[PDB]
Structures are given as structure tokens and as C-alpha cells.
């Protein structure tokens, strides 16, 4: 029946469609031609709707995605934990953003989110991705991502329809080496630290961290805090003030002067680090 939606006949046009599977609490693409991992980037790893629904039983997929590009028409709104145990909408922001943009929606594969594709332009100041106190969230793309299809329409919103979205900036938050080759630096050396477990004194954690964070950033202060707050060991704590500071200042400038060498992304004395590795 998923061929009966309009809106499925209308993505049916683009030979974009891939396959998903649930790995843990994630859901990786699949070339539904032969099983290999998609890249959101290469459309021969993609396929039509017809190849995505043979590759969906072969392969036993959970179901079936949608890669958005550019040149397409096509925005992708994802809404997160804004459904009931009945699958009725509970959080307001959800209910008014439903309200203001009526377009194909479904129910997403967990079942307590919501999907809504829209013909459009996103607005160009708004974050992609906004979490909210309530748990719920509200992630928006129109390119460089895939969205599952689960054809589960939703008020019988069936139709992908034009609307202007620059009503999108009143529930989306307004936004204006490189730490990234540091962390998979770090990754790789085996210097990013675990969450902490039960019993695990997480100051002295976060210390041994700000320790190695001084020497992969060369002591660059702002930079190991930017790092830090992408890591497991990232918390409320950090930012809490005391005497004067924070802790996770006190505790970057205590690293800062405990540490001896830098690290020279010029000299690539990575055997200048006086930690060893965290184990496993
Ligand atoms: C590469 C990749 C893409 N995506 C895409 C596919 C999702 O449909 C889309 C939105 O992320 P999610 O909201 O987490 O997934 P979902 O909306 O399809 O299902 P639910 O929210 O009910 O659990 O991001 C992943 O989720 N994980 C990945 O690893
Ligand atoms: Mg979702
Ligand atoms: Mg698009």
C-alpha cells in the first residue's frame, strides 16, 4: 500500500532510496543493490524504491530510507519523543508546529516520534538539530542526510505539500590542527577516556583527561575546553562556579601547568606523551 501514499509517489520519482537496520541506539544506511554501507554522498550506493523494497526483504533491513540532496525538492523535519503510548501528541511545540506546517507526516519506526516532509527552503539561520527540557527534540534537513519511510501516515497528512518554512525560526534556535583531527588523534592513541562507572572517583577522571588535553592541544586553553565538552566525561559540574572559576577552568589550568611537553602537530612527537594509553 506504501505506493498508494501521494507523498511516496512523489519521492518514488528520485532513485534515492536506500535500506536501514538498527545497530544499538543508531541506524546505518544500506546500498539496497548489495548490502555494503551507503554513503549520503555517492548516488550509485543508492537505488529506486523498487530496488530499496527487494533489498528490504533480502537483506532483512528494518526498512526504508530516503537520502535528500540538494537538487531535490524535498525538507526532512524530525521529531523526537513528542508522541503518547497511544501515539497522540503531547508536547505543545510539536502540536504547533503540526498546526503551521501541514504536510505528509508519518510516524517515525520508534513509534513516539514524527516525521513531516515538506517542499521548501530551510531557513538559513536556525540549528539543524534543537533539544528541548521536555526530552523531545527537533531536527531539520534538506540535504546531506537519509530519513527512514515508514509510510505510517499520520492524520491522514498524505500529500507532501508547498509551504513557506520561515515559520521553522520560531521552534528551531537561531545560530550565526582542528579540535576534530585532535579527538580522532587522541582516538586512535587511545587517549579518549570511557564514561565513567560505578564507584569511579570522575574528578580524578576528569584530571588524568585535562592532563592529556594539555598536551594534544599544546596547552591551548580554549581549545581543550571545546574538546572537553564532547566527551564522556562532560557534566553539570563542570560549569558550576567556585572561588572565583569554575571547576573545569580550575581544572584546565591546574593540567596546563602540571603538563611539561606539548604536542607539535609540526614535529609529530606523538612519543613526547608522558601517559600511557587507557586500557580496556
Ligand atoms: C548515518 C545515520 C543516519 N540517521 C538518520 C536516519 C534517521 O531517520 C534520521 C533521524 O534520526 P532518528 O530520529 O534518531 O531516527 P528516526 O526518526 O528514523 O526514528 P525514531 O526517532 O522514532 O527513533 O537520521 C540515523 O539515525 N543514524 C545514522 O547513523
Ligand atoms: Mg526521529
Ligand atoms: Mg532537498
Known sequence: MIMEIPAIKALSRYAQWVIWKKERDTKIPYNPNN???????????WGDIDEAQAGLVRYGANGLGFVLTKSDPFVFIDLDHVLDENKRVKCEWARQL?????????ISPSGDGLHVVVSGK??????????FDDGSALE??????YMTITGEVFDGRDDIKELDLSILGEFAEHKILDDEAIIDLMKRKGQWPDAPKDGDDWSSLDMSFANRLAFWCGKDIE??????????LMRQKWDRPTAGSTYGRITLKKACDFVDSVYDPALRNESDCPFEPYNE
Not at 548490502?35 to 550506493?45: H, M, Q
Not at 530551510?122 to 533539544?131: Q, R
Not at 531539520?140 to 542526510?145: A, I, L, M, N
Not at 581549545?223 to 564532547?230: A, K, P, V, Y
Open 35 to 45: 548490502g555494503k554501507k551507503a554513503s549520503s554522498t555517492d548516488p550509485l550506493a
Open 98 to 106: 503540526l498546526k503551521e506546517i501541514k504536510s505528509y507526516t508519518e
Open 122 to 131: 530551510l531557513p538559513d539561520y536556525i540549528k539543524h538539530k534543537t533539544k
Open 140 to 145: 531539520v534537513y534538506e540535504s546531506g542526510r
Open 223 to 232: 581549545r581543550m575546553d571545546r574538546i572537553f565538552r564532547q566527551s564522556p
